[PDB]
Amino acid sequence: VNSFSGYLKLTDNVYIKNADIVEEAKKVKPTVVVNAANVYLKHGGGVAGALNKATNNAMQVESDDYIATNGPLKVGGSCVLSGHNLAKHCLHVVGPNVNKGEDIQLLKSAYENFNQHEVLLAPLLSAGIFGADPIHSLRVCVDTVRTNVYLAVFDKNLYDKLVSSFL
Ligand SMILES: N#Cc1ccc(OCCn2cnc(N)c3ncnc2-3)cc1
């Protein structure tokens, strides 16, 4: 039993809710919140900008030190950093950005990072400003992630489209 509330069960291990990931995190304080990161951990907009703003820029400060030490992530890769006031840990995962021409096949590699964590609160990778089709992202999630994932979708219209088209 866990404290995630109000989710639709899609499969044995994937759940989805019409919800704000920052509010979910503030409420649940999950062990892991996933960020929709880029390779430079520059949290300017989208989910990343929202998560970072909610940490009062502490996520960005920590991320800048990470990059200065380690260099950029790979597309499809991840790193574990602090979750600050939102979660124990933040798993920064880089999905391909279609607006940068990146290969959508890398979306599966991106979701594989979730399997290193037993339970996660997450957005749909490569959705929104990353340019991919969120219906496709949800399908790859369900077909790749085997651990327990709680997906938070910002927009009622999108949430209803995802549910009503889910096979
Ligand atoms: N009109 C409209 C509209 C406004 C924001 C919006 O956010 C999508 C990405 N996103 C950003 N910030 C958050 N805290 C999120 N939680 C889940 N997804 C999140 C989508 C549609």
UniProtKB/Swiss-Prot annotation:
<feature type="domain" description="Macro 1">
    <location>
        <begin position="1"/>
        <end position="167"/>
    </location>
</feature>
<comment type="function">
    <text>Responsible for the cleavages located at the N-terminus of the replicase polyprotein. Participates together with nsp4 in the assembly of virally-induced cytoplasmic double-membrane vesicles necessary for viral replication. Antagonizes innate immune induction of type I interferon by blocking the phosphorylation, dimerization and subsequent nuclear translocation of host IRF3. Also prevents host NF-kappa-B signaling. In addition, PL-PRO possesses a deubiquitinating/deISGylating activity and processes both 'Lys-48'- and 'Lys-63'-linked polyubiquitin chains from cellular substrates.</text>
</comment>
<comment type="subunit">
    <text>May form homohexamers. Interacts with N protein.</text>
</comment>
<protein>
    <recommendedName>
        <fullName>Papain-like protease nsp3</fullName>
    </recommendedName>
</protein>
